[PDB]
Amino acid sequence: GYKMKTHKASAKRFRVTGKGKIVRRRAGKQHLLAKKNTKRKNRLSKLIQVDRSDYDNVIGALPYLKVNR
Amino acid sequence: FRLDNLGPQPGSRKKGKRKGRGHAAGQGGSCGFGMRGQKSRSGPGIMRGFEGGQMPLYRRIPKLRGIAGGMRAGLPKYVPINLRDIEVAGFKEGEEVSLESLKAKGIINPSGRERRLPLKILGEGELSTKLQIKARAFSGSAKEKLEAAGCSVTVLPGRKKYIKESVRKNLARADEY
Amino acid sequence: LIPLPILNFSGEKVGETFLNLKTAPPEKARAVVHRGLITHLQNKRRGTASTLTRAEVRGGGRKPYPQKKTGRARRGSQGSPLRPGGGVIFGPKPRDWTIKMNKKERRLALSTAIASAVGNSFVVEEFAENFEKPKTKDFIAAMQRWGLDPAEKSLFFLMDLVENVEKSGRNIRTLKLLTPRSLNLFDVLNAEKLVFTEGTIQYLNQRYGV
Amino acid sequence: RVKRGYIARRRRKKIRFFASSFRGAHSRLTRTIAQQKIRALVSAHRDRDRQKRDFRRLWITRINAAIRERGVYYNYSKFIHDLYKRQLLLNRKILAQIAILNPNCIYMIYNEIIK
RNA sequence: CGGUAGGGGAGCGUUCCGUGUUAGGGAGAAACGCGUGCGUGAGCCGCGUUGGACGAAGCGGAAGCGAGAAUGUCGGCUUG
RNA sequence: GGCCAGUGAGACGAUGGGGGAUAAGCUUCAUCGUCGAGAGGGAAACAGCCCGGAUCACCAGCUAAGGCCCCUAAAUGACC
RNA sequence: AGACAACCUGGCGAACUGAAACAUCUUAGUAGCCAGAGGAAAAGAAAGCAAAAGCGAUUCCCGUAGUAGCGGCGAGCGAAAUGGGAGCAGCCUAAACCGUGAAAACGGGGUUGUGGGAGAGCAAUACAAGCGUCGUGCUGCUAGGCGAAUCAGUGGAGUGCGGAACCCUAGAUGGUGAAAGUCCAGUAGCCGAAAGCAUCACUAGCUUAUGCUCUGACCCGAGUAGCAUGGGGCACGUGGAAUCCCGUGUGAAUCAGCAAGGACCACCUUGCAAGGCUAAAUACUCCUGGGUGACCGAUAGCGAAGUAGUACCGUGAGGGAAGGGUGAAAAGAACCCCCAUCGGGGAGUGAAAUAGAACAUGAAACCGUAAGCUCUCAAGCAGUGGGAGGGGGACCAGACCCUGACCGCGUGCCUGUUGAAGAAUGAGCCGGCGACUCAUAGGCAGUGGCUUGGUUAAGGGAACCCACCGGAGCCGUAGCGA
């Protein structure tokens, strides 16, 4: 019948890492980079966990990716 | 067991709660949806992932890198098999190890790609019992384990790429010792 | 485990023919065979039921009277479901579902039903039939001599389905013949009295071993 | 799979039979039979707690009116002064009952409260 | 051990189905009306100079499953 | 943490203030009490004030707030 | 020619909607309109997929897969290849060449792809298969035929109950005063067609036809492909934009070639466009013939159980109802009285006449009549607690039921608010109809089945369900990085 469709606008932003947790790329990097600090530009260059609110929001908005909790 | 005396265990089948059948039932009246709003009205309601007019969670985050470029994603090109899959197996001292051996034994069950990704033997775990492996290429540590066990190790060349005769000529010119 | 006598047209106690099946564990049995039964007679069902919703009836798709200036409700259809002239809400669509039950749970349901069938003197046992002139009198006479009433709803099944017992057995209501081609659970869990043959007790031990 | 029923009429006929002697459309008319069942039962609640309270009040004023027949200024409070000093544990205002069912015996009660 | 919005646990009832061509039933079933009975209650059980052929319980399942509201709606009958 | 809801209109009273005219049962905040979601008693009646937190029964007793001439239960109580 | 419910093809072709606005997009090439046509239609026999390994026309199902992608990279849209099944079937034509005719045609030849065909020469004969008015053949259908086995007692009637017997190749069903294996029609089984239709098997007969060597010359579908533009559609919204088809304009090569393999070039691989035709699997019901139903039972089920698309409304397009059940058998009331009828009472039929034609059970609102208690100095959401007086049957006679002198207390119910007796909303009343439901997926919880990891989908099956196959796929086994 009707399969659920994977939301592509968040599948390109979120990712599972083996143990089963959503990670994400930090924002504020491809715009006005001289104005910032190198401390900021490698603070905003790493991928981190998403917090539990929007870890449980998009877990049902992106169904086919095997995330526990 | 007769047709009479059969009955399910408790907890196996709960009753589906019916809504709007009385306030003593639990979800009477507004059927458990408060008073008003989009959560009480009938229809599709709210898109999941929508922040109420705020720019959402997914739009404020930049796209993942190769998925931003549209580059083809990282994809497994072999079957990763450790030596822990080989010791716990019932392979005895005289036994061949190949694709159909690991399929027919009960270690790998490959279905989606029987055609593309052959095999690879990795390093974690030991292998005390010697064998005769004719499978695809190895890691350096797994070559150290299998050559440390004194077993017959054989790499298998899978496919031959098509090299153009001027590229094969330019590469055959490079044989200058 | 427990033996059982092999009867005939005479009725001696020759042979053993042990019935060793794959039983369900205790406290877990009646939920398993209840589950296989309830999907047997749930899967036996069919759609066969229909009703016309608001979008199908030949009632009006018009506004019968305007929105205001009339002391009467806002009724915008004559085939509205609030009005008993047609149109229903949430009635039965003709649904042809698929309730799948596991194989080795259903085989264990059959093995638990036949496993609980024997032991409480509900199984006597035959081995052969040779019925020239099939006429249902030696059938009900052998049925009487084996200790089975024709009205007490017995059931029994035979290998290879010889035609002269299908011909002499299909008229009495209380029993119907089966075969390993057509061995169900609901027809065999009537469980009043039920017999086997040697090809069915050794086919039945051949399949549901240990 | 039509499901026309009769259970609203037994559900409703029981409440119909409870609402007898309600003087008019409170005893005949269903959409008021319900709320008279309801209001009759809460009337039974508050009039039960206040029948405990109300009979307490009635026995207080009844034994007060019994004690005040002496003429000399002996109130109801002084009857409890010398009803608990002379150790009589909890006659429970049923001396307001034998104060009229046995007036010589309540005269023996009070005339032994004096001594 | 008060309780609105709300959450969880446990149950009653209805029509159909398996047992079921069930027990029972023109020696009166269902209905309709009745109770000095029993339950926390949804309800059960019992009685009927009414009615005239169906249909329990138990163990289970499935719902067009439960009414006092929608200027609801369809019939009947009031008020003035 | 997992699953899964509502709520996001508050109101008055005391204190701390701003707006006002130190006017509003006015408006906005900060801590608290009640109502909301709280029955009963006192307040004549009367959401927010005081006592007080209702599982149920009793034709039981003792009390808090508050009262003891009559309506309406208890002192036409005592002494300044 | 006209008609045809739905499916199918071709053309015109939206908009409300979703994006929380909206224009790109979606809804959607859906609805609608027109045309055509058959029981199926379309497509269909590689100028094809694929990737150095291979498959062999088209269609449909499971799967890959909600993957690769596409997209104000928003809302959303979403393949294909590998794999597993259902069903299988391939054939005619143009050109080069000979012959007749001023061409245009005609008759032979040839229609193929790790290339053929034409031209020249050598051999060689019959195996197999295709098509088919025609009539003998077969089964099936459109009429039907034979077809087993019991009485008696019971309150109207027996099929139910109790007592005595039997059939079964028949105990499916419908009816018969009442429920049936033995009462009837039937059924199981055995039979049966003058005539027509259909199913495959004969037949006078037409046909398909063969192998080798040389020969790059001659041919292999031209205003066509390609290109510059304007686009459409392939999941792909002009993007690197390929494949496919069109509008204007330019405009090739024949096999030593041309096209495709996701701009394009080189090599290789694959195929041979610019010519047509084909059954099957496949989708649906205005229907037809069988079998079913945890489908309905007169507010339901078709709108329609009678005049049903009827009465009625509208100029018209069109909208659109409602009304079932006396009995088993009318046995439907002879006759007498009231009397102009309608109706009523006797009598008669019936088991029932309180089953009388408004006729089956008949509830509530509503209207009444009779019996018990009680109201005309009385303020009240009509109650409730206490209960004066009175009445009724009674047996655990103290109990139970009905009435209510008087006192205390008590601001209808829902909605929905900070707050509703509210003079905020709603309902004249009574009875019915009337609302978190269904399909498919993700996630979690609870109960199971296996852990020699688990489980099948499509599909096959004694008509369906089903035993048993069917390991395709899916999930967990390895992660990190773009």
Beta carbons of B95 and B131 less than 8 angstroms apart: yes
Cα separation, C138 vs C107, whole angstroms: 35
Alpha helices (H) along chain A: 8-11, 38-43, 53-56
| A5 closest CA partner among A66, A54, A56, A62 | A62
Going by C-alpha positions, the residue among C135, C111, C123, C116 that lies closest to residue C21 is: C111
Roughly what angle, to the nearest 10 degrees, separates helices D30-67 and D103-114?
50
Using only the alpha carbons of chain A, give its radius of gyration.
Answer: 15
Beta carbons of C201 and C55 less than 8 angstroms apart: no
Q: Give CA–CA dist D115/D110, Å, rounded.
A: 9
Residue in this structure with the two tokens 């009844």, named with its chain if needed: D62
Which positions 12-31 of B are in contact with C (Cβ < 8 Å)? Answer: 12
Q: How many domains does one find in chain C?
A: 1
Closest of A26, A51, A25 to residue A40, by C-alpha: A26
**Kindly report the CA angle at B168 between B164 and B172, in degrees rounded to 5?**
170
From D53's Cα to the closest Cα of chain C, the distance in A is 51
Q: Which residue segment(s) compose the domain that B93 sits in?
A: 74-158
Nominal resolution (angstroms)? 3.3
> Nearest to residue D63, comparing CAs of D48, D50, D78, D44?
D78
B125: which 2 tokens?
Answer: 């775990």
* Interface contact B62-A27, CB threshold 8 A: yes
Nearest Cα residue to C123 out of C1, C4, C12: C4
Which residues from chain B sit within 8 angstroms of residue A29, using beta carbons? 62
Radius of gyration of chain D (CA): 25
CA dist B146 and C43 (Å) reads: 55
CA distances in angstroms from C20 to C103, C108, C194, listed in the order given: 20, 13, 17
Q: Check if residue D87 sits with its Cβ under 7 angstroms from strand F.
A: no
Do you know the residue count of chain C?
210
Return d(Cα A59, Cα A55) in angstroms, integer.
Answer: 6
Quick check: helix, strand or coil at residue C178?
strand
Q: Which residue, among D35, D31, D32, D37, has the nearest Cα to D17 in the 3D structure?
A: D37
Rounded Cα distance, C143 and C175, in Å: 11
Q: At B44, give phi and psi (nearest 5°).
A: -65, -35
Strand order in the sheet with C194-195: C177-178, C155-157, C194-195
- C197 touches C128 (CB < 8 A): yes
Nearest CA in chain A to B46: A61
CA of C79 to C1' of G307 (A): 25
Angle of helix D7-18 versus helix D30-67 axis, rounded to 10: 30
The experimental technique behind this entry is cryo-EM
For residues D21 and C31, give the distance between their C-alpha atoms in angstroms, rounded to a whole number: 55
Residues 6+ apart with CB under 8 A from D86: D112, D113
- Provide the 3-class DSSP secondary structure of residue A9: helix
CA distances from C155 to C159, C204, D25, D78 (A): 14, 16, 65, 94
Q: What number of H helices and E strands is found in chain B? A: 5, 5
Mention every residue, 6+ apart, whose C-beta is less than 8 A from residue D87.
Answer: none
Say whether A24 sits in a helix, a strand or coil.
Answer: strand
Q: How far apart are CA B140 and CA B142, in angstroms?
A: 5
* Spacing of C-alpha C57 from chain mean position: 38
Give the DSSP per-residue string, B116-161.
S---EE--SS---S--EE--S-B-HHHHHHHHHTT-EE--------
Q: Which domain holds residue C95?
A: 1-210
Beta partners for residue A25, in sequence order = A47
Distance C96 CA to G440 C1' (A): 13
**How many domains are there within chain D?**
1
Chains A and B physically touch (3 or more Cβ atom pairs below 8 Å): yes
Helices and strands, number each (H, E), in chain A: 3, 3
What is the distance between the alpha carbons of residues C115 and C33, in angstroms, rounded to a whole number? 11
E-only strand ranges, chain C: 155-157, 177-178, 194-195
Q: Name every residue whose Cβ is closer than 8 Å to that of residue B86 and which is 6 or more positions away in sequence.
A: B97, B107, B121, B125, B127, B131
Q: Where are the alpha helices (DSSP H) in chain D?
A: 7-18, 30-67, 76-84, 98-101, 103-114
Taking the C-alpha atoms of residue C159 and residue C208, their distance in angstroms, rounded to an integer, is: 17
- Burial category of C113 from C-beta neighbours within 10 Å (exposed 0-12, middle 13-18, buried 19 and up): buried
Q: Check CB contact of A55 with chain B, cutoff 8 Å.
A: no
